[PDB]
Ligand binder design. Structure first.
Ligand code: 5HA
Ligand code: CL
Ligand code: CL
Ligand code: CL
Ligand code: CL
Ligand code: CL
Ligand code: CL
Ligand code: CL
Ligand code: CL
Length: 375
């Protein structure tokens, strides 16, 4: 068995409402289910009763909790919460064998943040300090782990869609992928920002200037469900996806996520929808690689038991490209913070059919990639 076996299958998800890991806080121990989010940088836990929460953090019962005498408020693209800052002992029982004192926000009120039936009770922001609230002086959890212990500065995510997966902390487990890992640079340590240099649908280049694909940033975000694309890119990609799936027409609201379409259980005609490839900047000058997803990744099930209903989960953004769970469920993704790069390989758990699989291929030659990023 590989050396990281005890961290394999440490994530769960309930009906596609977010992937979470168990974390144990305080003394004596309180274990809670915590959503894994590479799109933010605060660690925060429900800390008062809420109708969607089975468990919450009870600070008064932890003798090692320290109050930082400061409130915090975090708004996201979806939802927001407010709470109080402090520190406490934190361990991940199916994660690294260490315990660290970390900052923790105890959430006392929230709006449209917790999700009914999702089973998670807090959020682990794995991005960098630049985007933490109240500001970049509040050390994020992964920074605490690497400063206090000798766990290598890397983690990897395998999100397994329809729900579970693995977060390997401090290394890479070779059982979780097939083929080779291909790396793209982290452009700047704030979000996990990357540069997309070409987009194809069904093998056809969308032929927009690459500056449009990264206006004003492109990021890898396990806390967002969809692949979210800037306005001009979203409109062009939908027109091309429609053109490539013209054996059937679907109501316009389906491509806006407003309508669902359902098929008799097990009969969804995946072949009528195209594959979608993103090319990413590689590690050598003028070299790129591509990651390709299937409709099984970008059509998401919505849970009669004899019907399989789906929502189209590519959507519009006014804040750049967000490579959310629709992209990450195709791949084993290695967040190699020590070497400032993100690795992709085909996931051993990605959903596919007998005709097509997700892919990571390269190298391709793409010139002037340094022009694609926003400044
Ligand atoms: C949890 C759930 N996420 C969602 O349902 C979901 C969450 C967000 C969202 O704002 N997520 C937050 C974390 C955050 C986490 C939980 C609650 C609130 C905010 C993340 O830090 C945002 N990162 C910002 C840099 C973009 C945004 C969206 N969209 C706008 S969408 C419809 O285009 O996908 C959906 C989910 C479901 C399945 C797979 C992954 C995530
Ligand atoms: Cl909202
Ligand atoms: Cl402290
Ligand atoms: Cl360990
Ligand atoms: Cl330790
Ligand atoms: Cl390793
Ligand atoms: Cl037009
Ligand atoms: Cl939306
Ligand atoms: Cl070129």
């Amino acid at each position: 068995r590989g050396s990281f076996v005890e961290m394999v299958d440490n994530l769960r998800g309930k009906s596609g409402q977010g992937y979470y890991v168990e974390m144990t806080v305080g003394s004596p121990p309180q274990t809670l289910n915590i959503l894994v989010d590479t799109g933010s940088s605060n660690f925060a836990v429900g800390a008062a009763p809420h109708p969607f929460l089975h468990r919450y953090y009870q600070r008064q019962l932890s003798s090692t909790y320290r109050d930082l005498r400061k409130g915090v408020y975090v708004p996201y693209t979806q939802g927001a919460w407010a709470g109080e800052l402090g520190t406490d002992l934190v361990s991940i029982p199916h994660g690294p064998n260490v315990t660290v004192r970390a900052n923790i926000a105890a959430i006392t009120e929230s709006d449209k943040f917790f999700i009914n039936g999702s089973n998670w009770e807090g959020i682990l922001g794995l991005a960098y300090a630049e985007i933490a609230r109240p500001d970049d002086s509040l050390e994020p959890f992964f920074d605490s782990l690497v400063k206090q212990t000798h766990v290598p500065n890397l983690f990897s995510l395998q999100l397994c869609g329809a729900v579970g997966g693995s977060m390997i902390i401090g290394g890479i487990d070779h059982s979780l992928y097939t083929g080779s890992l291909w790396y793209t640079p982290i452009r700047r340590e704030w979000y996990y920002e990357v540069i997309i240099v070409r987009v194809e649908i069904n093998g056809q280049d969308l032929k927009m200037d690459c500056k449009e694909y990264n206006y004003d940033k492109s990021i890898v975000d396990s806390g967002t469900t969809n692949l979210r694309l800037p306005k001009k890119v979203f409109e062009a990609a939908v027109k091309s996806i429609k053109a490539a799936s013209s054996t059937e027409k679907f109501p316009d609201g389906f491509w806006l996520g407003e309508q669902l379409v359902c098929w008799q259980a097990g009969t969804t005609p995946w072949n009528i929808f195209p594959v979608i490839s993103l090319y990413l900047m590689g590690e050598v000058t003028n070299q790129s690689f591509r990651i390709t997803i299937l409709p099984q990744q970008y059509l998401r099930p919505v849970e009669t038991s004899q019907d399989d209903c789906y929502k189209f989960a590519i959507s519009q953004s006014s804040t750049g490209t967000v490579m959310g769970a629709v992209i990450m469920e195709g791949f084993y993704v290695v967040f190699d913070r020590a070497r400032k790069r993100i690795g992709f390989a085909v996931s051993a758990c990605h959903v596919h059919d007998e005709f097509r699989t997700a892919a990571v291929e390269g190298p391709f030659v793409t010139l002037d990639m340094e022009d694609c990023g926003y400044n």
